Design a protein around this nucleic acid. Structure first.
Lengths: 214, 558, 430, 220
DNA sequence: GTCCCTGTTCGGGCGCCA
DNA sequence: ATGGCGCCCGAACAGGGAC
């Protein structure tokens, strides 16, 4: 039962970049590690065993090295198949343990998200449902945040939201939170706002609306 | 009574026959004495009259030296023992407290009449006979054969043992908590049982042992603190052999020497490290019984130093498995090596020396190396466990020692200790023939008849030197010839020999040697700043060599 | 309940009062085990207690073997074997196979028990007597005797053959694409087939021996971290002779050349096309070895000439069963070691190097032992028999530690001896 | 080459047990270094080792699971299995089965895997979706580019497809994986079309939910 | 065919136990 | 009164190197 660690959870390089990944155990393991790469399409393939013996089939571009309780996985130049989560595996003390893999995302010149806030529909409202959404899309660093807040800057209870993967196209990303309040509240509170704040221009990108019509 | 244990058969060695030996006429009062004796022996069942067809005879005598409980009338079964078969003795040595662990209560029993308690193999009995003589009247004599184990028959020893065991066995099967170290006719018994409970068992035993014919005589041990055992004074926590008394008035006749020496050797169990070699030397030479060496002055030091050690009241504590085993050794004199096996610091388990002068030329590492092993084996025997080791010598030291030494040698787990005259190698030949020094070229030789010959050298620098001598050999010569070039060096030197022998004797890196010459050759190496040495064949005429040979002999030397 | 088979008469070579060797001490860890295993053998009826009355004796010892079976009892019948006369059915019933050495893999089975069924001459028995000892000598030694066949003894495999063979008889006719050799307690089986298949077919033979007259083998353990069992397999083919002999002095100095020629000289004893003289000349005259770089390209013609001779197979190998076998081990450099085998001096039949075992288990002896073992095995597979061992270790020493690492079911003959540089000339060929 | 596919329930009410089967096609579970492993990859979490069934029959379970974990393998038909009891939420994940094999004296890896298997834990049962359109409303058409979307709240069985205008729109769309609202899935996805286009020609979010076999079409 | 070294084993005296 | 065991000197032995 070893403590496996992949420090740099994820990183963003570019085509041709040479990348190195740091794998750490909690005791000497003696070249007893393996490197798997999970494809975003879920699949999971074996690259190298014995910490450096290349698995027949993996592109030479991949190379093994490491020792003691600190080991390393690396590739020479980037080609779009490799941008994946790479997992480190030990086979020493039977409680075989995979360290938390490392995502290998593409690097793209940042950009501000196009934000959109949508009001609640009569269609739903008339049944009690009072859901509100705010589409924050195509922005560069995943790193970002939204602040759902009604007159009185509070991130009220009813915040559901998820972000996509790196659109293998424009390499950007996008998320979307949803405010859920009762019609009683949709009626009560006046305005409703979405506060997106990104590594844009020290700017709190905000969109809002006011209409408590039932 | 007698033990009904199935008797062990015992043949006579293939070839020989029974011991028939004329019984010379003993003294008058003795006759009757011996008689009065046998009689008792008879009703006892120890013996019986025999038929006039057992011709085999062995001499007998008797003599009760002034004692009540004691009476003497012994036989000299020499010719018989000389004739009887050899059986494999049973014994991997005696015990020792050091291995003996600890129990809440203990006892020490001795079964009486042991020998005479086991019956003799009926068959072989025919031999163990004897004639007790008479005076005039009944012109004819009395014959008696042994029906049990004879008091001086090689058999008996082991016999009694093997027997006594079988007896103890089931009881052992019955109480796997009580402990019993059987020794010939002596039973040390122990177990962690409340003194009362402990009591019921011993008796239980006593009854059983006695039941099999083994009397459990009143010479039983109860007085806890003082337990007379195997010579060791066994205490509820410490062990010791108080009888550590010594003789000194005699200190002269060889025996007296040999007496002390051993006493020491003997007392070497817990009395920390002593040097007997000092005196032992004085024990060598003339082994003439009456002669009395007096180099006593020379070893005075040892005698007294030890004397005072033997003065200081020591003791050994008991073995505990919960803890672990270890032993540290120190170097006393050149050969003097001693250790100490303890589990806890100043409380010692057992001590002991060592001085094996192994090879004809052996260095100081070998010594410790060897030293350690004696500890090992011994310890194995005492605890069936290898103890860790505290040895006087650094790491890089023992390391290089082997790294260079082209011959397997190792040591079980050991840690470093910085204290006594730390062991280390003195001189050490250099790797590559260093530059900036003269490449000498040695040689030497002689002839069986000569007993005389020369031994010298040259130097790339044309220089030479030669030296004839006597009372040596082709071997000594070649070895001697090393000495010169050595002597005539300084800060460095490239030596060249063709003699593996000497060559080897040196490579080993020898700390000493009974031989002066080679011992001397050491000191120079000990002195010099750098030495090196290479080997070259002889009769193939190689290097300046061809010149040194003729230099040493014009087909022969002067 | 031993088999009702009649009994083979065994009366050792004449003027041989059997053995009388003594029992070296043994560790706790050993006693206990050796005891247990020794005791239930008494129960089944295999062994019987005896006392002092028996003059004869031999030594025994545990050996914690890494596997599902308990430790193993071991009896040094070495001397016994020596005393016991010659048996035809031995050689006869146990002849050596060639193709044997020629295979993709070979395995080894501890098939001792087989001997447990067949009995043993009532008389010849006293010559097997051994003795288990105790810590601190709590009690005296306790000795036993073998009633049936003792595990490890010339005479033993010698007899059981009939049985041994016919049992195997099916397996062969069943598929003779594998071969088998018997050597005392051991069964040597080799299949040129694929490892897994080989390993499986091996396992077959197991079960077979099981159903047949309860011949039960060990069951070597197998695990996940540093996978030793994966190697248990024995694949010879890749077994070349110690081709370690070189030099390439691009500016040979007095020493370099001198040294070397002292070496080349000794080689003349094995090899014929040897010429030390040419270089001996480049060396002629009391020169300063130190630093003198007497570069000589004249002799270069005969220096690369000896090389041809050193590069090939020494034509002379004339193996002879009628003669004994021998082996020298040399501590040539830290880590690695050397073996050379022959019957006739400087006329070796094969050579080699057991090197480091890539494990932090640093221990001179351990290796030496390991050496002899792997050396032996190797020899067994070839000419069959077992070489004597000129041991590069001091007696007292070797003794106190060899048991702790041994692992065979036999123990070859060894002797101790000192070493000169003659062979240290890396040219291990003694 | 050798491969293997796993199979099971996909959906299981909490506090119950389940059986996953891995059917392989290459090696056999009778060879010295072969073996089959079981791994579980959670919602976003990494790779956890459940256990590994070995050829000689030496099985090793996770110390944190063995207790409620058990394996097997009908050798004869190249089928190993995993059994997990009293399955609580967490356990809900994509389990995989990989061919592990001891290559050599120093090597043992999961040479071959096979797209895991979803297994969801939930009391909840088959529910149709509650689809709602997301219009610009109040803030009418301003920029020459506009975003539109759809609210899919109230469905249970995970799978649910939806596109725009019968797949016509594929150019500028974003769709996001739903989250466990009230032990139910709520999803939304948006589109952005050039001004001229929407105020003019119609746009439609069209959702599909297999299990509730409900189809639907929400315009504007 | 031989001396040379050298590394072992006894015998041996001895203290120690039974 | 014969067995064992370990020390500490000699005496004699046998086997690699070698004239």
């Amino acid at each position: 039962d070893i403590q496996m660690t992949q420090t740099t959870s994820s990183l963003s390089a570019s085509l041709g970049d040479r990348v190195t990944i740091s794998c750490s155990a909690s005791q000497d393991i003696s070249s007893y590690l393996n490197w798997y790469q999970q494809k975003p399409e879920g699949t999971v393939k074996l690259l190298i065993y014995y910490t450096s013996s290349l698995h027949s089939g993996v592109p030479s571009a991949f190379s093994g090295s490491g020792s003691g309780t600190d080991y390393s996985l690396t590739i020479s130049n980037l080609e779009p198949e490799d941008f994946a989560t790479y997992y480190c595996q030990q086979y020493s003390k039977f409680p075989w343990t995979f360290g938390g893999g490392t995502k290998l995302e593409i690097k793209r010149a940042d950009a501000a998200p196009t934000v959109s806030i949508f009001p609640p529909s009569s269609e739903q409202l008339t049944s009690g449902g009072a859901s509100v959404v705010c589409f924050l899309n195509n922005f560069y660093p995943k790193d970002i945040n939204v602040a759902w807040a009604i007159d009185g800057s509070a991130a009220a209870n009813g915040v559901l939201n998820s972000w996509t993967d790196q659109d293998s196209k424009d390499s950007t990303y996008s998320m979307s939170s949803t405010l859920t309040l009762t019609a009683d509240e949709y009626e009560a509170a006046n305005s409703y706002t979405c506060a997106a704040t990104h590594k844009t221009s020290t700017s709190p990108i905000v969109k809002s609306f006011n209409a408590n019509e039932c | 009574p007698i033990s009904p244990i199935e008797t062990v058969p015992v043949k006579l060695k293939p070839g020989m026959d029974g011991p028939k030996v004329k019984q010379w006429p003993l003294t008058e009062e003795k006759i009757k004495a011996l008689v009065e004796i046998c009689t008792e022996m008879e009703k006892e069942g120890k013996i019986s009259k025999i038929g006039p067809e057992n011709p085999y005879n062995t001499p007998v005598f008797a003599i009760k030296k002034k004692d009540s409980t004691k009476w003497r009338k012994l036989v000299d079964f020499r010719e018989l023992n000389k004739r009887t078969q050899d059986f494999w003795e049973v014994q991997l040595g005696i015990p020792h407290p050091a291995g003996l662990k600890k129990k809440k209560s203990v006892t020490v029993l001795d079964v009486g009449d042991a020998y005479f308690s086991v019956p003799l193999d009926e068959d072989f009995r025919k031999y163990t006979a004897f004639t007790i003589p008479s005076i005039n009247n009944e012109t004819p004599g009395i014959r008696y054969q042994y029906n049990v184990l004879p008091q001086g028959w090689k058999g008996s020893p082991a016999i009694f043992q093997s027997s006594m065991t079988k007896i103890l066995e089931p009881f052992k099967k019955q109480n796997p908590d009580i402990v019993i170290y059987q020794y010939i006719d002596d039973l040390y018994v122990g177990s962690d049982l409340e003194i009362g409970q402990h009591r019921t068992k011993i008796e239980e035993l006593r009854q059983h042992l006695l039941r099999w014919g083994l009397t459990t005589p009143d010479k039983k041990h109860q007085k806890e603190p003082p337990f007379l055992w195997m010579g060791y004074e066994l205490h509820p926590d410490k062990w010791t052999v108080q009888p550590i008394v010594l003789p000194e008035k005699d200190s002269w006749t060889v025996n007296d020497i040999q007496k002390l020496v051993g006493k020491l050797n003997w007392a070497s169990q817990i009395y920390p490290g002593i040097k007997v070699r000092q005196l032992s030397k004085l024990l060598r030479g003339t082994k003439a019984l009456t002669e009395v060496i007096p180099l006593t002055e020379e070893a005075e030091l040892e005698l007294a130093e030890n004397r005072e050690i033997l003065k200081e009241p020591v003791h050994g504590v008991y073995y505990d498995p919960s803890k672990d085993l270890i032993a540290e050794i120190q170097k006393q004199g050149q050969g003097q090596w001693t250790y100490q096996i303890y589990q806890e610091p100043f409380k010692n388990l057992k001590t002991g020396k060592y001085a094996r002068m192994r090879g004809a030329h052996t260095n100081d590492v070998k010594q410790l190396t060897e030293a350690v092993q004696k500890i090992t084996t011994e310890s194995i025997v005492i605890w069936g466990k290898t103890p860790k080791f505290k040895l006087p010598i650094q790491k890089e030291t023992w390391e290089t020692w082997w790294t260079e030494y082209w011959q397997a040698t190792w040591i079980p787990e050991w840690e470093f200790v910085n204290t006594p005259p730390l062991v280390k190698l003195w001189y050490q030949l250099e790797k590559e023939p260093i530059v900036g020094a003269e490449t000498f070229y040695v040689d030497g030789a002689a002839n069986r008849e000569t007993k005389l010959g020369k031994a010298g050298y040259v130097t790339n620098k044309g220089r030479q030197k030669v030296v004839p001598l006597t009372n040596t050999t082709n071997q000594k010569t070649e070895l001697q010839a090393i000495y010169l070039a050595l002597q005539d060096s300084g800060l460095e030197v490239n030596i060249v020999t063709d003699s593996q022998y000497a060559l080897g004797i040196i490579q080993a890196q020898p700390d000493k040697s009974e031989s002066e010459l080679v011992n001397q050759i050491i000191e120079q190496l000990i002195k010099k700043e750098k030495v090196y040495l290479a080997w070259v064949p002889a009769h193939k005429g190689i290097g300046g060599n061809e010149q040194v040979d003729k230099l040493v002999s014009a087909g022969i030397r002067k | 309940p031993i088999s009702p088979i009649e009994t083979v008469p065994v009366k050792l070579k004449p003027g041989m009062d059997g053995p009388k060797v003594k029992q070296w001490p043994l560790t706790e860890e050993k006693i206990k085990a050796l005891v247990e295993i020794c005791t239930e053998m008494e129960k089944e009826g295999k062994i019987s207690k005896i006392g002092p009355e028996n003059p004869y004796n031999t030594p025994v010892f545990a050996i914690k073997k890494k596997d599902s079976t308990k430790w193993r009892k071991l009896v040094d019948f070495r001397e016994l074997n020596k005393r016991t006369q010659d048996f035809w059915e031995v050689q006869l019933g146990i002849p050596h196979p060639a193709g044997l050495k020629k295979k993709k893999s070979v395995t080894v089975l501890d098939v001792g028990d087989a001997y447990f069924s067949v009995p043993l001459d009532e008389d010849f028995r006293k010559y097997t007597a051994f003795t288990i000892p105790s810590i601190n000598n709590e009690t005296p030694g306790i000795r036993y005797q073998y009633n049936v066949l003792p595990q490890g003894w010339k005479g033993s495999p010698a007899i059981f053959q009939s049985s041994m063979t016919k049992i195997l008889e099916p397996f062969k006719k069943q598929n003779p694409d594998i071969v088998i050799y018997q050597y005392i307690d051991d069964l040597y089986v080799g299949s040129d087939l694929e490892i897994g298949q080989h390993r499986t077919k091996i396992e077959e033979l197991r079960q077979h021996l099981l159903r047949w007259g309860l011949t039960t083998p060990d069951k070597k353990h197998q695990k996940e971290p540093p996978f030793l069992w994966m190697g248990y397999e024995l694949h010879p083919d890749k077994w070349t002779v110690q081709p370690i002999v070189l030099p390439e002095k691009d500016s040979w100095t007095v020493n370099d050349i001198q040294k070397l020629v002292g070496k080349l000289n000794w080689a003349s004893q094995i090899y014929p096309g040897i010429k030390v003289r040419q270089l001996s000349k480049l060396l002629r005259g009391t020169k300063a070895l130190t630093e003198v770089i007497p570069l000589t390209e004249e002799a270069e013609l005969e220096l690369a000439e000896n090389r041809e001779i050193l590069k090939e197979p020494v034509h002379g190998v004339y193996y002879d069963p009628s003669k004994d076998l021998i082996a020298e081990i040399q501590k040539q450099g830290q880590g690695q070691w050397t073996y050379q085998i022959y019957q006739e001096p400087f006329k070796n039949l094969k050579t080699g190097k057991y090197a480091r075992m890539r494990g932090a288990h640093t221990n001179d002896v351990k290796q030496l032992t390991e050496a002899v073992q792997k050396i032996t095995t190797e020899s067994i597979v070839i000419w069959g028999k077992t070489p004597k061992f000129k041991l590069p270790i001091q007696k007292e020493t070797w003794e106190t530690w060899w048991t702790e690492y041994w692992q065979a079911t036999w123990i070859p003959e060894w002797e101790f001896v000192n070493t000169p540089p003659l062979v240290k000339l890396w040219y291990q060929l003694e | 080459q050798i491969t293997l596919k796993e199979s099971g329930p996909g959906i299981v009410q909490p506090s119950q047990p389940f059986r996953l089967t891995c059917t392989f096609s290459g090696f056999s579970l009778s060879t010295s270094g072969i073996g089959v492993t079981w791994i579980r990859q959670p919602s976003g979490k990494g790779l956890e080792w459940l256990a590994t069934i070995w050829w000689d029959d030496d099985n090793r379970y996770n110390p944190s699971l063995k207790s409620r974990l058990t394996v097997s393998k009908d050798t004869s038909n190249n089928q190993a299995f995993l059994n997990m009891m009293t399955v609580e939420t967490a356990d809900t994940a994509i389990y995989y089965c990989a061919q592990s094999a001891i290559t050599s004296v120093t090597d043992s890896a999961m040479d071959h895997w096979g797209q895991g298997t979803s297994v969801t834990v939930s009391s909840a049962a088959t529910t149709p979706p509650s689809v709602y359109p997301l219009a610009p409303g109040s803030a009418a058409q301003t920029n020459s580019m506009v975003t539109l979307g759809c609210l899919v709240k109230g469905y249970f069985p995970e799978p649910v497809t939806v596109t725009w205008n019968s797949g016509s729109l594929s150019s500028g769309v974003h769709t996001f994986p739903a989250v466990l609202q009230s032990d139910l899935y709520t999803l939304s996805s948006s589109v952005t079309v050039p001004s001229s286009t929407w105020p003019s020609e119609t746009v439609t979010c069209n959702v599909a939910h297999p299990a509730s076999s409900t189809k639907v079409d929400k315009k504007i």
